């Protein structure tokens, strides 16, 4: 049946519009793709996806949209019906998109009130094979979300969107894949919102090199020099000027999308971080707060 | 049936006996109670338990015994009976104790192999009411253990030894009570071993002054001053010279022993620590390793 | 006689008006009450004082005014006379204030040249009983001032304004009260200026939570968490983006305004901080400097 | 009368003899002078004073004696009277010394219970002009004491022992000179005991070099590099493995012993430390405690 | 012949023009000389140099020009020929300057593409003797450059501009003097660019005082207090809000411009910093990146 | 000709015999091979080398010997004559060794006075293929020595011992190989001594897991985890309780012993460390000191 196949971008609503714009292009290593009096689009130098981040000047910080990819026009419609069947509020009907790089798609809110987008045939952008030591994002690695009822959110993603379970951290954190990457989405309990967005680095040396630039650029590592167990990926968390959290990650495991057997890792500090030599932890990072405007569009504000 | 009513003491086998010995009497705040060629006893100044810590000069660091209390001599026998039905290896029949403070007790191995002692009528010692600012322990607060089958270890503590579930952190960490204190035992997953032993302080002020003393003695706080959710107690974890970890804690809740309803807390950063302004994390503390000589007594080595 | 009964607000002239405006509403925990081109008003959520902070957009950082409260028009007129007798430079006569909240007051310069305001019947704002863990200020706790002639500055607060001495730190720091709070004003030797403004928290836990919210906002603790001796209050000092310092405090002793016996505390390490587990110290906060515009109203600039 | 003219040495009773004996010989920079079953003498390489530190294997830490120096054999006698006419218990009648280095002197307890010694003609030891960057002590700089009646205690020092006042920190800390150096003794209120013994370094560079050696050897600065105001000396406090604090100081001002005009400095953060760019503070060093065995010699234990 | 005899100023092209503007005035300690819509000039309070820093609102941070001094209007003409004969691209012919303080000079590019300026007779501005503890720059100390062919860059500076070599750190870093100071210029390997601009402090104390100010102002010492071996000057590096690095330096030796003989220090860990006690290190500072627009003026952009 | 093919072990004369001895078996990860009252041999678990570390109880710390390995008995004699010719002071004539493991070899002093040993047929010990995450050493990676005439000391290793140059850091640090490993020995300017010994780890993960064990053992990283340029090896430096420095390293390049072209890297922060996010640096490690007893065997003492 038709399913989500990748993540496209994350649209942010940010107060400190300018500070956040400079961050992504002069600090985080993303490539500007376009600006407008009220918006800004950036893209990952190592991927052909039109844009991976969208910034909209707003009166408050929030996540406007989480855009997922579908293979074809007939796949976008199938998920359109599937979402309806599951009882979701549909904010838009499948049609050519006026947003950058066009594409055919629709929008619907998740059972929690977070706006999502599913689209196909979105224009492609440039893409080069990065050399080692550049310290810049190759592509998006994953997105982590909080949910008031995570078990159900996990099922929506599996039964409606087509994700499959790759791992479990006890019974509170689930890792979901929609292709051969260990996971592209991770669901966690808490108020309906987004926790962080990770970016894939070419190598461990690159994550370090990037973390280094971020340090001199005045941003310290919120939780760094670590390596997770579920997915076995190295990590480095940061807080953007806008107050969001972004992560440089690397070496996430490749699996067989169709046959990977998930495991239930037993919680333990060593399980969250197998290195235990960096600084900070999940406590030095912002505390989750319900995303402003649940079931509301960026417009409605 | 009858049940365990309190914790008496923990017996440690230590490699650097001399250094460990000087730690408890001159840094930690315990009162020397007795000594000999290969052993040393210590008691908390604010409680009349004959002694709360016993050290044995050994070749390898380990836990020799976790000593528990029972109200009566026939309570000790009832517990000998329970253990038998649970199928535990009994190391001693209920008899008069030759250990300091005497008493009537027996020893049995928990399903994982750690050695426990259940006894009653142990000679009381000297006790006095501490004054704010002394910065010394009042009595032992709790003991946390790791178990390869933590669900079973919990049922053992509740069904065999009569403890009761006071709280849960997900499905991986359980808090058990044997009296009005929120807990005296907490089970956690991992190889069969003892995580740490906590000592109750008179006030948050005494934990701070205590932590201060340790700091000037050369011992840094392993997990900065904080406050847990389950039990609402403040904490300060330290590593001893023998490599064991001890914690100064305060304000542990009081509950009705029978009517207290337990809760399942959702794992979250701010759940392990509601303050989040100290240094360290469980990661700066030793990784759990199986206790040397499972199902073996001190004689074994 | 007639006297000052409490603190109202503190008016600041800030060069970086926007960063300071954002600091109070999004980090410090105060409630915005009004804004115009060159001004911003903030209120403490746990008190009905119309506003506790006023910020004026300025070319240079300074303290524009420290407003105090009196019980009634009569009391204010009386104090106004008292001020004259003590030979002070009066900047206005008892009249209906035109600032937000209204009221009946007048302004005058302390013997040192700092502008103070005494007023009565200022409108009452809304007030809320905070819940533990919110980490936001309940009310203004105290204000510390520097005076070239502290011995005299104290006499002026006691004899003209009615404040009474609650304690002395050796012979250089005096704590003064004007109600049941140990103190609302403290006098320290140094150029004529304002040292810090302290905000009272519901509990020590709340102080810690506030400190944590600030840590994730990127504002480190200037003088780590501690507990003072005089007044027995816990403290957490911070440097605002505007350059001033603010403090989260709690557990400030309550005393009988009339019969409280003051003590002279002998200066010592353990006297400034009875905990000694945090970081920083007075040596790590900005050095006091004469307040710009002595004996000059904010107009003058 | 005649007067004390210089500090000779300090004698400590240390529980952890070995550790401390190692400290001074390899880490601190003092050259050994002679050993024995329970005694170790140490010398400062840049001064002819036979030995500046005496260690005695004891059960609990304590100050056994603070050895001072007199010029002639008869100046001693002239003091033995002053002490008598002061009412001090005398522990030794002027007699030829049986302690390493010989000499003639007596022992008596001061008004607070700390044993002092006054001698003359002790055998000089070797001395070489140290070179910049060696990072070892040149001689002892000063000793700071704690007194329950510091005002009287100072008068004892000035009137009975012949010291003069050089500076006052408010009314709680008095600097006393017995020669050219700004001070060799400083008095602080508190339980009767020694606070720290400070050694002089050839320069600021040597202090840092010195601190650098202590750091690599595992001893962190208790009170970071700073510059005191009273005396204008750079500082660096440390904690010996025995629980005693020592200091590497430099650039202590020289004054005319006779005419030096003393000043009363106003207490202030910037006063204790004019640099304020390091870590620690009195806060992070041992809290004072009554010296064990008041009015008792070491032979009493 | 005629030769450069001093450094005048550095002109930066800054993106966050206002943040950098405020840094030099409010934080770094320079004095505003003038401004217009797109430029700001700053002056050292301790040097008659008209100005030592120029900022220009730019799209991207870069070095716009490095201004040098010549003694006479004919020296400038001479250097204008030497530069020509060396193959340097001349950006302007020797004439009266239209920049503040005027003067007579011209602009040419060094062999690597950095725009330089040589001038004479520039108007002197205010000047005064700083007092110990003021914590502000006296004048400019030195400027460090990165060159892809530093051996050639060194020869350019000596054979063309008239600089002399005062020292070598191995064979990768050169120290050049234009007057009595050990060096005003230092060449290092790497892409063509400016490493840092260092400001002279009255004394080591001032550097500490200065650094403490940046500390409370929210700027951490990028490379802790230390002392270099070449020049023996104490150092403290910082990262400006603009992204450039500036250092407070003191005690840089003096030398006989004519006779001084250069040494070749053997690299060694402890040669870069003879104290090795401060925090950070060259690793916490930005990595050298070719100055944007080599061989192009600020206009082209 | 016949040449050195590997590093066997290092013998240290350590004053704190018991601490250093505990270090290697309970902290560093080496396995005890032998013991008596004043000696202790240690073995690396991933190599069959009989023992790689030797401790000798001593009055002063020093490098007793640096034992190299030759392929055969004849090979050994060849080198014995080859050493004879270079003019070294032989200390033993080729012959069966009474030391653990036996073998045939001799000891001679290098031009700088360090005592070396070249033996063959030393008894092989047990070896295990470690699994990822054990965090224990596999083998000895390299040894770094200081030389007052480093240039000649290199020719000695290449022309006399048979090593080959794999790289140079500027003209001060040389990297020598005796097989396919990028290097096994590194020479650096300085007083004749041993800088540090490095231990190869199975992977970067194991070094991190190793550094974590040392952290919880109270032994912090002297030079934060990083990555060298020459050899591309990841690093982690530590100071042992005895005062020596050990390094956990990984990913050192494998090269072709014969056809490997070396390079001269230009010194520069990013070259010493390509990551730049750990702590400390060469400066936070002990200063090199001439080795006690130059040209003298352990027996002299
Ligand atoms: Mn992640
Ligand atoms: Mn605990
Ligand atoms: Mn305060
Ligand atoms: Mn001192
Ligand atoms: Mn410099
Ligand atoms: Mn190495």
DSSP code of B61?
Answer: -
Say how far apart CA F41 and CA F21 lie, in whole Å: 9
**Which of F22, F213, F216 is facing B239, going by the closest CB pair?**
F216
Say how far apart CA C188 and CA C153 lie, in whole Å: 9
Task: Tell me the three-class secondary structure of A264-294, residue by residue.
Answer: EECCCHHHHCCCCCCCECCCCCCCCCCCCCC
- Residue A45 alpha carbon to ligand 1 centre in Å: 20
Backbone torsions φ then ψ of D195, nearest 5 degrees: -95, -55
Helix boundaries (H) for chain E: 17-22, 73-85, 150-155, 204-216, 269-272
With beta carbons less than 8 A apart as the criterion, state whether B72 and B118 touch: no
What residues in chain C have their Cβ under 8 A from chain A's Cβ atoms?
A: 212-213, 215-218
The answer to whether E and B touch (≥3 CB pairs < 8 Å) is: no
Q: Which residue has the tokens 């054999």?
A: D73
DSSP code of F242?
Answer: T
Shortest Cα distance, chain E CAs vs residue F237, angstroms: 14
- Residue A246 alpha carbon to ligand 5 centre in Å: 35
Q: Provide the CB-side half-sphere exposure for C132 (13 A, CA).
A: 7
- SS3 category, E174: strand
- Look at F286 and D26 and tell me if their CB atoms are within 8 Å: no
Burial bucket for residue A96 (CB in 10 Å: 0-12, 13-18, 19+):
exposed
Phi-psi region of E142 (alpha: psi -120 to 50; beta: other; left: phi over 0): beta
**E strand or H helix that includes residue D19:** helix D17-22
Q: Degrees (nearest 5) of the Cα angle E223, E227, E229?
A: 120
Torsion F218-F219-F223-F225 (CA) sign: negative
Chain F positions in Cβ-Cβ contact with residue E189 (cut-off 8 Å)? 266, 268
Which residue pairs, CB below 8 angstroms and at least 24 apart, start in D285-288? D285/B216, D285/C269, D285/D196, D285/D222, D285/D223, D285/D237, D285/D239, D285/D245, D286/B216, D286/D239, D286/D243, D286/D245, D287/B212, D287/B213, D287/B216, D287/C269, D287/C270, D288/D146, D288/D190, D288/D191, D288/D193, D288/D195
Ligand-binding site membership of F247 (annotated): yes
Burial bucket for residue C153 (CB in 10 Å: 0-12, 13-18, 19+):
buried
- Look at F284 and D215 and tell me if their CB atoms are within 8 Å: yes
Strand-by-strand arrangement of the A115-120 sheet: A31-36, A39-43, A53-57, A6-14, A62-69, A115-120, A104-109, A90-96
Q: Are strands D62-69 and D115-120 parallel, antiparallel or unpaired?
A: parallel
Chain D positions in Cβ-Cβ contact with residue E205 (cut-off 8 Å)? 227, 274-275
Say how far apart CA B208 and CA E246 lie, in whole Å: 40
Q: Experimental technique used? A: X-ray
What distance lies between CA F87 and its chain's CA centroid? Answer: 24
With beta carbons less than 8 A apart as the criterion, state whether E118 and E65 touch: no
Say how far apart CA C245 and CA C61 lie, in whole Å: 12
Ligand-binding site membership of C104 (annotated): no
Helix boundaries (H) for chain F: 17-22, 73-86, 150-155, 204-215, 269-272
Phi-psi region of E119 (alpha: psi -120 to 50; beta: other; left: phi over 0): beta
What distance lies between CA F122 and its chain's CA centroid? Answer: 18
Q: Which residue of F has its CA nearest to D212?
A: F284
What residues in chain D have their Cβ under 8 A from chain B's Cβ atoms?
A: 15, 222, 239, 241, 243, 284-287
Ligand nearest to the CA of F252: 6
Per DSSP, what are the bridge partners of residue D104?
D96, D120
**E strand or H helix that includes residue B106:** strand B104-109
- SS3 category, D17: helix
E-strand ranges in E201-270 read 223-227, 234-239, 245-249, 263-265
Strand-by-strand arrangement of the F139-147 sheet: F223-227, F234-239, F245-250, F193-200, F139-147, F185-189, F173-177, F164-169, F264-265
- Residue C198 alpha carbon to ligand 3 centre in Å: 5
Q: Around Cβ B298, how many Cβ atoms within 10 Å?
A: 16
Residues in chain D: 301
How far CA D125 is from CA of D9, D28, D76, E297, in Å, comes to: 13, 19, 21, 70
Say how far apart CA C163 and CA C174 lie, in whole Å: 11
With beta carbons less than 8 A apart as the criterion, state whether B64 and B298 touch: yes
With beta carbons less than 8 A apart as the criterion, state whether C137 and C247 touch: no
Q: Around Cβ E42, how many Cβ atoms within 10 Å?
A: 23
What residues in chain F have their Cβ under 8 A from chain E's Cβ atoms?
A: 170-172, 189-190, 266-270, 273, 276, 280-285, 287
What residues in chain D have their Cβ under 8 A from chain F's Cβ atoms?
A: 22, 26, 213, 215-218
Say how far apart CA D152 and CA B264 lie, in whole Å: 63
- SS3 category, B191: coil
Per DSSP, what are the bridge partners of residue B264?
B168
With beta carbons less than 8 A apart as the criterion, state whether F156 and F107 touch: no
Say how far apart CA D295 and CA B270 lie, in whole Å: 54
Say how far apart CA D60 and CA C245 lie, in whole Å: 45
B230 closest CA partner among B194, B177, B278: B177
Per DSSP, what are the bridge partners of residue D251?
none
Ligand-binding site membership of C142 (annotated): yes
How far CA D177 is from CA of D120, D183, D263, in Å, comes to: 18, 4, 14
Say how far apart CA B74 and CA B93 lie, in whole Å: 13
Q: How many CB pairs under 8 A join C and E?
A: 12
Burial bucket for residue D169 (CB in 10 Å: 0-12, 13-18, 19+):
buried
- For F144, the token pair is 């770094």
- Look at D284 and B217 and tell me if their CB atoms are within 8 Å: no
Say how far apart CA E202 and CA A168 lie, in whole Å: 62
- Look at E267 and F170 and tell me if their CB atoms are within 8 Å: yes
Per DSSP, what are the bridge partners of residue A42?
A32, A53
Burial bucket for residue A163 (CB in 10 Å: 0-12, 13-18, 19+):
buried
What distance lies between CA D225 and its chain's CA centroid? Answer: 20
With beta carbons less than 8 A apart as the criterion, state whether E134 and E127 touch: no
Q: Which domains does chain A have, with CATH numbers?
A: 1-121 (3.10.180.10), 138-285 (3.10.180.10)
Q: Are strands A173-177 and A164-169 parallel, antiparallel or unpaired?
A: antiparallel
Q: Around Cβ B119, how many Cβ atoms within 10 Å?
A: 25
- SS3 category, D157: helix
Q: Degrees (nearest 5) of the Cα angle C103, C109, C115?
A: 60
Torsion C8-C12-C18-C20 (CA) sign: negative
- Look at A270 and B287 and tell me if their CB atoms are within 8 Å: yes
Per DSSP, what are the bridge partners of residue B146?
B188, B193
Say how far apart CA B279 and CA A123 lie, in whole Å: 48
Q: Which residue of C has its CA nearest to E213?
A: C286
Q: What is the dihedral of CA E255, E7, E246, E108, to 10 degrees?
A: -130
- SS3 category, F272: helix
Burial bucket for residue B154 (CB in 10 Å: 0-12, 13-18, 19+):
buried
Interface test with D, best of F62, F196, F215, F286 (most D CBs within 10 A): F286
E150 closest CA partner among F272, F267, F189, F230: F267
**E strand or H helix that includes residue D155:** helix D150-155
Q: Around Cβ F57, how many Cβ atoms within 10 Å?
A: 17
- Look at E285 and A216 and tell me if their CB atoms are within 8 Å: yes
Burial bucket for residue F261 (CB in 10 Å: 0-12, 13-18, 19+):
exposed
- SS3 category, D30: coil
With beta carbons less than 8 A apart as the criterion, state whether A41 and A51 touch: yes
């Amino acid at each position: 049946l038709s399913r989500v196949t990748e993540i496209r971008y994350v649209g942010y609503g940010v107060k400190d519009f300018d500070a956040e714009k400079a961050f992504y292009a002069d600090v985080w290593g993303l490539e500007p793709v376009g600006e407008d009096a009220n918006n800004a689009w950036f893209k990952a130098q190592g991927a052909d996806e039109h844009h991976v981040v969208q910034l909209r000047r707003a009166d408050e910080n929030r996540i406007d949209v989480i855009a997922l990819a579908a293979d074809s026009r007939s796949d976008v419609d199938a998920l359109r019906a599937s979402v309806e069947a599951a009882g979701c509020k549909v904010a838009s009907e499948p049609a050519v998109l006026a947003t950058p790089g066009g594409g055919y798609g629709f929008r619907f809110f998740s059972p929690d009130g977070l706006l999502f987008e599913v689209s196909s045939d979105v224009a492609k952008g440039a893409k080069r094979d990065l050399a080692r030591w550049e310290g810049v994002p190759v592509k998006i690695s994953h997105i982590v979300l909080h949910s008031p009822n995570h078990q159900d959110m996990v099922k929506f993603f599996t039964d409606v969107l087509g994700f499959k379970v790759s791992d479990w951290l006890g019974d509170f954190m689930c890792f979901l894949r929609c292709n051969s990457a260990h996971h592209r989405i991770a669901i966690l309990p808490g108020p309906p919102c987004l926790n962080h967005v990770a970016y894939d680095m070419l190598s461990v040396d690159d994550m370090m090199r990037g973390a280094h630039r971020l340090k001199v650029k005045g941003i310290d590592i919120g939780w760094g020099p670590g390596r997770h167990t579920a997915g076995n990926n190295t990590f480095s968390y940061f807080v953007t000027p806008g107050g969001f959290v972004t992560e440089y990650t690397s070496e996430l495991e490749e699996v067989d999308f169709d046959t990977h057997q998930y495991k239930v890792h037993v919680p333990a500090p060593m399980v969250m971080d197998q290195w235990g030599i960096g600084t900070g932890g999940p406590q030095t990072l912002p505390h989750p707060h319900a995303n402003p405007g649940l079931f509301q569009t960026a417009e409605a504000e």
